[PDB]
Write a protein that binds this ligand. Structure first.
Ligand SMILES: CC[C@@H](C(=O)OC)[C@@H]1N=C(c2ccc(Cl)cc2)c2cc(OC)ccc2-n2c(C)nnc21
Ligand code: NI
Length: 112
């Protein structure tokens, strides 16, 4: 009921993060990191729990998320992975911060 409503809120946020409006900074987070393709051969030694928006979308579509907290923990994990792997002055870190600002301000408007 109110839980369903909280998950619709989460799905709305997800759709927004995937939307054209935010694509300039959201695009690195759309799909799983392909470490080989990027020559980032240390990625999976540093990042033990990869996460990306397509995975979040699959989990939402499959009704994997049972509550908003579970959903938010994955979205936040995605940002954390970026903050852990990359130096803090890299462009992709700025992009992550901007996308997380979008996430956090809308997530905060949680139906209650
Ligand atoms: C994973 C390796 C990291 C990188 O490329 O270091 C070699 C990478 N940087 C980037 C990255 C680097 C520079 C810019 Cl301007 C944007 C993204 C990256 C690029 C992608 O292109 C498909 C997908 C994922 C990432 N990404 C995320 C998310 N977190 N770190 C990265
Ligand atoms: Ni959390």
């Amino acid at each position: 009921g109110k839980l369903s409503e909280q998950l619709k809120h989460c799905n709305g946020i997800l759709k927004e993060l995937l939307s054209k409006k935010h694509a300039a900074y959201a695009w690195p987070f759309y799909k799983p990191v392909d470490a080989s393709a990027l020559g980032a051969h240390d990625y999976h030694d540093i990042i033990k729990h990869p996460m990306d928006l397509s995975t979040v979308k699959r989990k939402m579509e499959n009704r994997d998320y049972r509550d908003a907290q579970e959903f938010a923990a994955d979205v936040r994990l995605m940002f954390s992975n970026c903050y852990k792997y990359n130096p803090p002055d890299h462009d992709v870190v700025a992009m992550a911060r901007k996308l997380q600002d979008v996430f956090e301000f809308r997530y905060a408007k949680m139906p209650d």
